[PDB]
Amino acid sequence: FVNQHLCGSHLVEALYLVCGERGFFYTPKA
Amino acid sequence: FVNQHLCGSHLVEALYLVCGERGFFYTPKA
Amino acid sequence: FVNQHLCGSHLVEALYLVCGERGFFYTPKA
Amino acid sequence: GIVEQCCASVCSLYQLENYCN
Amino acid sequence: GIVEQCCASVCSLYQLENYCN
Amino acid sequence: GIVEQCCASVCSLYQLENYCN
Ligand SMILES: [Zn+2]
Numbered sequence: 001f002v003n004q005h006l007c008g009s010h011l012v013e014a015l016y017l018v019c020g021e022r023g024f025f026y027t028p029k030a
Numbered sequence: 031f032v033n034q035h036l037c038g039s040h041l042v043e044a045l046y047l048v049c050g051e052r053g054f055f056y057t058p059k060a
Numbered sequence: 061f062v063n064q065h066l067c068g069s070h071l072v073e074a075l076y077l078v079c080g081e082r083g084f085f086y087t088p089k090a
Numbered sequence: 091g092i093v094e095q096c097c098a099s100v101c102s103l104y105q106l107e108n109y110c111n
Numbered sequence: 112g113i114v115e116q117c118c119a120s121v122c123s124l125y126q127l128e129n130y131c132n
Numbered sequence: 133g134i135v136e137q138c139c140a141s142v143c144s145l146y147q148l149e150n151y152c153n
Contacts, residue, residue, distance in 0.1 A: 061146065063144060064142065064143060065139070065142050066138040066143065067139040071134075071138050074138075074148055075151055075152075078148045078149055078152065079148075079151070083152065083153040084151050084153065086151070087151075088135035
């Protein structure tokens with residue numbers, strides 16, 4: 001696991017991989 | 031449904047979701 | 061097949077399509 | 091078209107409903 | 112949050128482990 | 133390599149055929 005530059009859809013996608021069946025919260029500064 | 035910034039492949043992908051089995055046309059200014 | 065601007069994840073993804081079951085090497089300048 | 095705006099400015103899914111068959 | 116940094120700067124997968132349930 | 137050009141400039145799928153096994 002290295003340093004990733006993740007923007008937009010690619011970010012919630014990385015969360016899908018890192019959390020899986022645990023689930024996640026996507027809270028961007030509104 | 032909010033305002034989306036969609037570029038490149040992410041755009042025809044949003045069309046896939048919005049149209050589905052209806053089908054779509056991808057016409058970018060050439 | 062036209063000229064594509066491919067960056068980041070979209071690039072290894074284009075390799076998946078172009079190589080398939082042949083396999084590929086992803087070597088970015090480190 | 092939408093390709094232009096959806097990328098240069100911003101668009102809505104209801105506007106993308108225009109490009110469907 | 113992470114949305115901000117993961118895009119403006121850079122983040123690690125172990126930092127993304129924070130947003131899981 | 134291609135990573136560099138495919139992103140900084142532009143590349144073709146036939147050039148991506150070079151990175152296959
Ligand atoms: Zn992208």
